[PDB]
Amino acid sequence: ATGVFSPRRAQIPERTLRTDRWWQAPLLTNLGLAAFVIYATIRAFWGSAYWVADYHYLTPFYSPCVSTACAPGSSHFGQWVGDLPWFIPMAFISLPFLLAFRLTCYYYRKAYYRSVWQSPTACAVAEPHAKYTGETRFPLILQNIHRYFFYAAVLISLVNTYDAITAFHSPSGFGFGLGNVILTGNVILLWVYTLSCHSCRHVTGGRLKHFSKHPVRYWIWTQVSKLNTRHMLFAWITLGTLVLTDFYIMLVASGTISDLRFIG
Amino acid sequence: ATYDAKLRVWRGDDTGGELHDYTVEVNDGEVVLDIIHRLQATQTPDLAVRWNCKAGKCGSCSAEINGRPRLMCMTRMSTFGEDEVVTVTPLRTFPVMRDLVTDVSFNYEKARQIPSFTPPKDLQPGEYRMQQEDVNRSQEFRKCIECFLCQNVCHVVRDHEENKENFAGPRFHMRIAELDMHPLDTVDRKEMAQDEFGLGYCNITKCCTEVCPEHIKITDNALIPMKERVADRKYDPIV
Amino acid sequence: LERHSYDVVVIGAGGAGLRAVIEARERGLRVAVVTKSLFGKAHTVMAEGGCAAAMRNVNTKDSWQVHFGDTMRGGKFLNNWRMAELHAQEAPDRVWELETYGALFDRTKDGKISQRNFGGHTYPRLAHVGDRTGLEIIRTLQQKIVSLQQEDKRELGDYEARIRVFHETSITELILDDGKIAGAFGYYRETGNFVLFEAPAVVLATGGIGKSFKVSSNSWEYTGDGHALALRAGSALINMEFIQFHPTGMVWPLSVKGILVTEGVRGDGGVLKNSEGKRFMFARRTPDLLPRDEVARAINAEVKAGRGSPHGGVYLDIASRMPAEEIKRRLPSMYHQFIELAEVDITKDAMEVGPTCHYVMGGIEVDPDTAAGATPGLFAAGECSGGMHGSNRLGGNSLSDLLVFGRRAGLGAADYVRALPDRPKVSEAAVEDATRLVLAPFEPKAEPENPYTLHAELQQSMNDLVGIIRKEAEIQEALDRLQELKRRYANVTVEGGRVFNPGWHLAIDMRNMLLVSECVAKAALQRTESRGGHTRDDYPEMDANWRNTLLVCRVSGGDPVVPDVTVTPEQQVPMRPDLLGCFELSELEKYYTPEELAEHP
Ligand SMILES: Cc1cc2nc3c(=O)[nH]c(=O)nc-3n(C[C@H](O)[C@H](O)[C@H](O)COP(=O)(O)OP(=O)(O)OC[C@H]3O[C@@H](n4cnc5c(N)ncnc54)[C@H](O)[C@@H]3O)c2cc1C
Ligand SMILES: CCCCCCCCCCCCCCCCCC(=O)O[C@@H](COC(=O)CCCCCCCCCCCCCCC)COP(=O)(O)OCCN
Ligand SMILES: COC1=C(OC)C(=O)C(CC=C(C)C)=C(C)C1=O
Ligand code: SF4
Ligand code: F3S
Ligand code: FES
Ligand code: FES
């Protein structure tokens, strides 16, 4: 055949000789990704139960809310575009950019190249593909623009930070109600994930040659590298925290007590 | 706990081969290479091995110990149960010479295509000055004992023989990164890393870094930074 | 069968061999590089210390005079003084030019090469990177070779126009024309096919002899080749009785069987080394690293008369000592390495340490300025060379020795080749003889001998009877059973073919190992005094006069394992003005006879 069944390579007629469960991690990746995608799509297109008027709670999945069909008070940057027809999500400004940012992420590329595309399914298991070009041809060569989605993600993180800051509200001014805790934790973890990005590491000081003549960027690069060593973990953690933030906010909007600390 | 283990060592040459069942005595604290040496001295005098130091620190004893690319002199052999069969085969990416020895010459052919270190052509040998923080990144890559396990496991060339001439492999793209991050080097190499050594073939599934006996962060510290630099040079609309 | 023509052949790619190749190419020569292992995988990779070079980066009070005195002290003034002086004053240049090749050492605050302190050096001298200095050196040299052949490709249109590397190739004979080098004969490991090189000059640089001993830190390739090659070609060996043994090396767990254990571990709880007794008979110091001859004698006695280990060593327990976390901090690398490699917990269980062969200070008798050879165009450098370290080596001196004298050997070979009227010619009869000799182990040979069994018996005999402590009767018994062992070697039968057959390779290496073992045993029997690495129990009085005597080994005759004669020549008049004054009369009167008469003002 092609890869390990080539004429000059040692005659082993077994696809792999591994005796462990090398297929366990791809399954976990696939179920996690599928669960997040399903939940995110359904909740983003639901179109309701996303805003608490009393405590100014807004789901990140609806965060830039720029339509006149939106709940009163949800538009923090004005109302720009009419009414949406059942297939434009209320957060159509940011959802494409966040989806592209996580689709071009270096970690996520590893995850789905292993899991969906079976590029390596596992490390020493032979491919179900006969030809392979990698990221050299037209579709996959576009993964090299990830830094621009990183810039967009920085802007969207600023928008979410504004949302979290304005969430500290009560019907009598200032308020603190565990929705603030969930939102603030989610925003902090999103910032950690955004700042542990491989493109951030390159842009800050990764592309420099002499760290000795750039003391500030050397320090920034050192801290960003320390964060980047845990980049796999922060992606999954932020997926989870996004899901829980949405779920809690939806529960409160539909109906449930907020567990306020400064009652309003 | 001295017991008799079941090995399933691969025997043959480039014309064909087969796994063979051997029973060898295993003592506590022995590596796979010790078991191979005992088998050589007791049952198979002509078994092909190619070890040199037996302490790590070289790359001679690269094999696939139970489906995983390992060093034979570093595999603890207590990783496996006493009733578990251990299957030792040669590297499956390179042409097989004999039983456990492969023709690792694609690597030495790739080694002399990469431009070498080029210092400024005025600096005298005693007049070099480098700070430690300027050399840490390349010093990490200089830890590489040329075992070529990374080259073996990579799917770009492991599963595709036609990609051998277009892709240099993890070790030599790491070498390009090491020369690029040298504070005193002069040559750029960024364009050639993409155009002649095929950095684009690399998807970053990271199975290399996972086989490195030296624990070099090949993908995170060398390959992704070089891809970002190539994107600086080629794929950045800010021009 | 396969013939190549070159100007010089360097048999071995380590520090010395690669430096010689670079130098010979610089002088302008076609160089063939023959290596028994893969390219860049020589024993040099295993060194973890540094290069001793008086660069003065750390403190500026260092000089080549101080380094020269340190080398002469560590060696008990048995050193070749010209070689020591030349290494002292040429070492910084080689280290500096290493980093013009792309080497990256550790740096100081000023941006210079960092230097560490070591045992026998007065000042910090050892240029280092982590603990991988040998790997850095060999990588730098190999990449410099690749760069040079890239230049050859650009200018002459061929990578191997001036330098070609023949890895996985083993040289078994040196061909002579009229007592002069005419070429080298060997085989390819991969195919078993025979290759003849036809160069008028050969640089040996083949390493050590550590595979003749049961416990050793040396590589698979340290079978004494080079020593035997020069000895059969007609050169001479010196100081073969001077072998470095570390008294404390792991013996039982095969995964760690030659790893050296430093005396820093004994800077804590020491060797219980018995079943029920701490047997060193014990601020009045604990018996912590007494002059390691005394520790070695205690270990030998307790192996013979005492509770020895099943593997022939001692225990050295640190578990029943300072707490587990204190150990894991004081001993970072050793604990991790041992736990991951031998499943031995340093904080829980005792070790299995014992004497281990590390380095051989003897080798081919060289000209100090040029390289070796008496009659032929033969040259030698590195561990296979003899003379620099007299009775004992300083740590760090070997790595810089490699560069200094590899460059000297390459330059001497280039000078010899340029000063040559006509080139010596290989004769076909010699090639037929070498072919017959290397093919002999394939015939049935009634009463067959297994190569592995013979090798193990040789290793056991050398470990038992030629060790740290030598006795006259044990050395005599070692010679007596070496005669029997070399008689049994005539019946060695190899099963299989010629395609990368390691049993055949071992059978070939065994003749060199037997010759080198005979030389070592005879030298150790003849030197009746103790100095450095050579300890005689029946002559404990270190440093007899016995200092202007080299005790040179030569071949007499009778194949296929020739016998040796060891003679006693005098050394050259000690030191011309290398009688510094920091070399006081007080210090020199402990090593020299009242022969100076030309030292004090
Ligand atoms: C474990 C260990 C640790 C050490 N640590 C230190 C240290 O910290 N500091 C220090 O100063 N010194 C150290 N030394 C000693 C030092 O490394 C050696 O003296 C030095 O490496 C010798 O180098 P070389 O170039 O002479 O030979 P090497 O590089 O060891 O090898 C010689 C070459 O010759 C080739 N060869 C041999 N026989 C043949 C043949 N028949 N045909 C073809 N080719 C052949 C071999 O394949 C090899 O390539 C250490 C030694 C050991 C074993
Ligand atoms: C947290 C939320 C985010 C989670 C998202 C995870 C879900 C990801 C699952 C989808 C990605 C799986 C596809 C990965 C492989 C894509 C197929 C491919 O490799 O393209 C081949 C060809 O197939 C195609 O044409 C691809 C068409 C569909 C791909 C479109 C999107 C997939 C990945 C795009 C990444 C985004 C880059 C663009 C920036 C917006 C070319 O590969 P080759 O080695 O066989 O070379 C042969 C050359 N002819
Ligand atoms: C393989 O051919 C292609 C390129 O290289 C010539 C590109 O740069 C690009 C542009 C891609 C980026 C990331 C600028 C595309 C789309 C392409 O198909
Ligand atoms: S990189 Fe790590 S794995 Fe690849 S060769 Fe060098 S050491 Fe072996
Ligand atoms: S496994 Fe090989 S394909 Fe790339 S990410 Fe590592 S070099
Ligand atoms: S590389 Fe993963 S978010 Fe940027
Ligand atoms: S034998 Fe040198 S690396 Fe295992």
CA angle A15, A110, A142 (to 5 degrees): 120
Q: Find where tokens 């590589």 sit.
A: C219
Nearest Cα to Cα of residue C142 among C101, C105, C171, C106: C101
Q: Does ligand 2 lie within 6 Å of residue A140's CB atom?
A: yes
Q: Is C600 exposed, middle or buried (0-12, 13-18, 19+ CB in 10 A)?
A: exposed
Residues C566 and C563: their CA atoms lie apart, in Å, by 10
Q: Residues C267-281, buried b or exposed e (16+ Cβ, 10 A)?
A: eebbbbbeeeebbbe
Chain centroid to CA C267:
28
Resolution (A): 2.5
CA of A105 to the centre of ligand 5 (A): 16
Nearest CA in chain B to A142: B235
**Is any Cβ of chain A less than 8 angstroms from the Cβ of B183?**
yes
Among residues C38, C14, C163, C185, which one has the least CA distance to residue C500?
C38
Q: Are C23 and C411 in contact (CB under 8 A)?
A: yes
Q: How far apart are CA C14 and CA C9, in angstroms?
A: 14
Residues C416, C420, C421: CA angle, nearest 5 degrees: 170
Q: C170 CB under 6 A from ligand 1? A: yes
Sign of CA dihedral C141, C145, C151, C155: positive
Under 8 Å between Cβ of C532 and C243: no
Pick from C297, C220, C283, C239: which is nearest to C571 by CA?
Answer: C239
Q: What is the Å distance from ligand 3's center to C151 Cα? A: 34
Parallel/antiparallel/unpaired status of strands C194-197 and C181-188: antiparallel
**CATH hierarchy code of domain C449-566:** 1.20.58.100
SS3 C375: coil
The CA-atom distances, in angstroms, between A249 and each of A62, A181, A222, A245, A254 are: 11, 12, 37, 6, 9
Structure tokens at C511: 């003749």
**What residues in A contact B62, CB-CB < 8 Å?**
none
* Amino acid symbol at C423: R
Top residue of C22, C37, C38, C106 to mutate, by most chain B CBs within 10 Å, is: C38
Q: Over the range B123-146, which residues count as b (16 or more CB within 10 Å of their CB) and which as e?
A: eebeebebbbebbebbbbbbbbbb
Burial C214-248 (b: 16+ CB within 10 A, else e): bbbbbbbbbbbbbbbbbbbbbbbbbbbbbbbbbbb
Rounded to an integer, what distance in angstroms lies between the CA atom of residue A167 and that of residue A59?
10
Check if the beta carbon of residue B46 is closer than 8 Å to that of residue C498. no
Mutate to test the interface with B, among C255, C352, C494 (most CBs of B within 10 A): C255
Of all residues in chain B, the one with the smallest CA distance to C39 is B108
Structure tokens at B7: 């090995």
Instruction: Specify whether the CB–CB gap between B137 and A210 falls below 8 A.
Output: no
The residues facing A51 across adjacent strands are: A58
Report domain extents, chain A.
24-255
Residue of B nearest to C216 (CA): B53
C244-356: which CATH architecture?
Alpha-Beta Complex (3.90)
B183-193 residues labelled b (16+ CB within 10 A) or e (exposed) = bbbeeebbeeb
Length of chain B: 239
How far is C-alpha C181 from the chain's CA centre? 24
User: B158, B142, B150: which is closest to B219 by C-alpha?
Assistant: B150
Inter-chain CB proximity C143 and B117 less than 8 Å: yes
Euclidean distance between CA atoms C254 and A97, whole angstroms: 58
Task: Say if residues C353 and C249 touch (Cβ distance below 8 Å).
Answer: yes
In angstroms, rounded to a whole number, what is the distance separating the alpha carbons of residues C377 and C200? 7
Complete DSSP assignment for B58-84: S-TTEEESSSSEEEGGG--S-SS-TT-
Catalytic site residue C266? yes
Question: To probe the interface with C, which of B24, B36, B52 has the most C CB atoms within 10 Å?
Answer: B52
| Buried b / exposed e along C139-148 (16+ C-beta atoms within 10 A) | bbbbbbbbbb
The CA distance from C119 to C220, in Å, is 29
Listing DSSP states for B190-237 in one string gives HHHHHHTS-GGG-----TTTTT-TT---IIIIIIHHHHHHHHHHHS-S
Residue A191: alpha-carbon gap to chain centroid = 11
Q: Do C562 and C516 meet the contact criterion of CB atoms below 8 Å apart?
A: no
Nearest CA to ligand 4 atom 8: B147
Q: Which residues of A touch B70 (CB under 8 A)?
A: none
**Burial class of residue C93 in the structure, from the number of CB atoms within 10 Å of its CB (0-12 exposed, 13-18 middle, 19+ buried):** middle
Q: Is cis: bond before C502, omega within 30 of 0?
A: no
Residue A95 Cα to ligand 3 midpoint, Å, equals 25
Q: In whole angstroms, what separates CA B52 from the centre of its chain?
A: 16
Q: Calculate how close chain B gets to A74, using CA atoms only, in Å.
A: 35
Helix runs in B99-218, H state only: 106-111, 132-141, 149-153, 155-158, 170-180, 190-195
Known catalytic membership, residue C246 = yes
What are the residue boundaries of the structural domains of chain B, listed by start? 1-103, 104-239
Which residues of C262-398 form beta strands (DSSP E)? 353-360, 363-365, 378-379, 385-386
Which one from C19, C121, C125, C246 is the annotated catalytic residue? C246
Ligand 1 centroid–CA C358 distance in Å is 11
Enumerate neighbours of C (3 or more CB pairs within 8 A).
B
CA distance B53 to chain A (A): 25
Q: C residues 317-356 near B, CB within 8 Å?
A: 340-344
Question: For ligand 3, what atom is nearest to the CA of residue A145?
Answer: 13
Q: Does residue B154 have its Cβ closer than 6 Å to ligand 4?
A: no
CA atoms within 13 A on the CB side of B44: 20
Would you tell me how many other CB atoms lie within 10 Å of the CB of residue A216?
A: 9
Q: Pick from A251, A244, A101: which is nearest to A183 by CA?
A: A244
Pair of tokens at residue C84: 């020591």
Cα–Cα distance list, A239 to A90, A97, A151, C39, C180 (Å): 20, 16, 19, 49, 77
Of residues C131, C94, A194, C448, the one with CA closest to residue B55 = C131
Specify burial of residue C529 (Cβ count, 10 A radius: 0-12, 13-18, 19+).
middle
8 Å CB contact of B134 and A131: no
Q: What tokens were used for C233?
A: 């070609």
List Cβ<8 Å contacts ≥24 apart for C166-169.
C166/C32, C166/C33, C166/C34, C166/C35, C166/C195, C167/C13, C167/C35, C167/C37, C167/C38, C167/C39, C168/C35, C168/C36, C168/C37, C168/C38, C169/C34, C169/C35, C169/C36, C169/C195
Helix axes A231-255, A24-46, angle to 10 degrees: 40
Strand partners, B26: B3
C100: DSSP letter: T
Pocket probe mutation, ligand 7, options B32, B34, B36, B53, max atoms within 8 Å of Cβ = B53
**Dist CA C137 CA C87 (whole Å):** 17
**Cβ–ligand 4 contact at B144 (below 6 Å):** yes
Identify the active-site residue in C266, C408, C511, C536: C266
- Are B89 and B18 spatial neighbours (Cβ–Cβ below 8 Å)? no
* Alpha carbon of residue B123 to chain centroid: 34
Interchain pair C502, B49: CB under 8 A: yes
What is the spatial distance between Cα A224 and Cα A204, in angstroms, rounded to a whole number?
8
> Which tokens is A110 given?
């590893």
Report the relative pairing of strands B10-13 and B3-7 from DSSP bridges: unpaired
Task: Give dist(CA A72, CA A54) in Å, integer.
Answer: 11
Q: Which residue from B10, B8, B86, B94 is spatially nearest to B48, judged by alpha carbons?
A: B10
Cβ A196 vs Cβ A224: under 8 Å: yes
The minimum CA-CA distance between A106 and chain B, rounded to whole Å, is 7
Contact criterion met (CB below 8 Å) for B19 and B89: yes
Beta-carbon contacts of B58 under 8 Å, excluding residues fewer than 6 positions away, are: B52, B145, B147, C41, C45, C46
* Axis crossing angle, helix A179-195 with helix A215-228, rounded to the nearest 10: 110
User: Are B29 and C452 inside 8 Å of each other by CB?
Assistant: no
Query: Smallest Cα–Cα separation from A105: which of A26, A183, A196?
Result: A196
Distance CA B147, CA B153 (A): 12
Q: Which residues numbered 124-153 in C keep a CB inside 8 Å of some CB on B?
A: 129-130, 132, 135-136, 139, 143-144, 146-147, 149-150, 153
**CA distance linking residue B41 with residue B47, whole number of Å:** 10
Residue type present at position C30: R
Strands B3-7, C564-566: pairing kind? unpaired
Q: CA B217: distance to chain centroid?
A: 13
Residue C68 one-letter amino acid:
F
Measured in Å, residue B134 CA sits from the centre of ligand 7 at 31
Tell me the C-alpha distance between B202 and B219, whole Å: 10
Cα separations in angstroms, A139 against A44, A144, C9, C484: 27, 11, 54, 75
DSSP string, chain A: --SSSSTTS----SS----S-TTHHHHHHHHHHHHHHHHHHHHHHH-SS-EETTTTEE-GGG-S--STTSPTT--SS---S----SSS-TTTTTHHHHHHHHHS-HHHHHHHHHHTS-TTSSTTS--S-S---TT-SHHHHGGGGHHHHHHHHHHHHHHHHHHHHHT--BTTB----SHHHHHHHHHHHHHHHHHT-HHHHIIIIIT-S-GGG-HHHHHHHHHHHHHHTTHHHHHHHHHHHHHHHHHHHHHHHHH-----SS--
- Chain C stretch 22-51, residues whose beta carbon is closer than 8 A to a beta carbon of chain B: 37-41, 43, 45-46
Q: Which chains touch A (3 or more CB pairs under 8 A)?
A: B
- Residues of B whose CB is below 8 A from A229: 220
C-alpha torsion sign, points C28, C30, C36, C40: positive
Q: Which ligand is nearest to the Cα of residue A143, counting in written order?
A: 2
Q: How was this structure determined?
A: cryo-EM
The Cα–Cα gap between C402 and C405 comes to 6
The H-assigned helical ranges of C311-427 are 324-330, 332-342, 397-418
- Report d(CA B66, CA A121) in Å as an integer: 18
3-class secondary structure, C171: strand
Could you tell me which of B55, B174, B185 has the C-alpha nearest to residue C134?
B55
**Phi, psi for residue C246 in degrees, rounded to 5:** -90, 125
What is the DSSP-derived secondary structure letter of residue C571?
P
Which of A88, A55, A90 lies closest to A75 in space, CA to CA? A90
| Assigned token pair, C263 | 């005396």
| C-beta A59 within 6 A of ligand 6 | no
Chain A, nearest residue to B80 by Cα: A19
C582 lines ligand 1 (CB under 6 A): no
> Is residue C579 classed as helix, strand or coil in its secondary structure?
coil
Q: How far is B159 from chain C, CA to nearest CA, in Å?
A: 25
Distance of alpha carbon B145 from alpha carbon C178, whole angstroms: 44
The token pair that represents C470 in the structure block: 């030598």
Picking from C104, C113, C343, C344 by the largest number of B CB atoms within 10 A of its own CB, the best residue to mutate is C104
Burial of residue A25, with CB atoms counted within 10 A of its CB: 0-12 exposed, 13-18 middle, 19 or more buried: middle
Ligand 3, atom 16, residue with closest C-alpha: A138
Q: Could you tell me which of C400, C394, C395 has the C-alpha nearest to residue C382? A: C400
Helix, strand, coil share (%) of chain B residues, nearest 5:
35, 15, 50
* Consecutive H or E run containing C298: helix C292-304
Q: How many CA atoms lie within 13 A of C115 on its CB side?
A: 24
The one-letter code for the residue type at C180 is K
SS3 C397: helix
- Tell me the C-alpha distance between C330 and C346, whole Å: 12
Q: Sign of dihedral through CA atoms C210, C187, B70, C104?
A: positive
The b-or-e profile of C532-571 (16+ CB within 10 A means b, else e) is: bbbbbeebeebbeebbbbbbbbbbeeeeebbebebeeeeb
Nearest residue on chain B to A231, judged by CA atoms?
A: B220
Handedness of CA B193, B196, B201, B207 (dihedral sign): negative
Q: Confirm if C442 and C504 have CB atoms less than 8 A apart.
A: yes
Cβ–ligand 4 distance for B210 under 6 Å, the answer: no
Measured CA to CA, the distance from residue C138 to residue B152 in angstroms comes to 23
The answer to whether residues C111 and C71 touch, using CB atoms and an 8 Å cutoff, is no
Q: Give the orientation angle of helix C15-27 with respect to helix C397-418, to 10 degrees.
A: 30
Interstrand relation of C535-536 and B96-98 (parallel, antiparallel or unpaired): unpaired
Q: How many whole angstroms separate alpha carbon B92 and alpha carbon B72?
A: 15
Cβ burial A130-155 (10 Å sphere, 16+ → b, else e): eebbbbeeeebeebbbbbbbbebbee
Measured between beta carbons, the chain B residues lying within 8 angstroms of C452 are: 40-41, 45
A212/B133 Cβ within 8 A: yes
- Cβ neighbourhood burial of C256 (10 Å; 0-12, 13-18, 19+): buried
Cβ C145 vs Cβ B117: under 8 Å: no
**Side-chain-facing half-sphere of C564: CA atoms under 13 Å:** 33
Amino acid at C12: G
DSSP label of C102: T
Task: For residues C227 and C384, give the distance between their C-alpha atoms in angstroms, rounded to a whole number.
Answer: 6
Neighbouring-strand partners of residue C564: C555
Q: Hey, what's the torsion of the CAs at B155, B157, B158, B161, to 10 degrees? A: 130
| Sequence-ordered list of residues with C-beta below 8 angstroms from that of B131, at least 6 positions apart, any chain | A211, A212, B183, C107, C111
Nearest CA in chain C to B128: C112
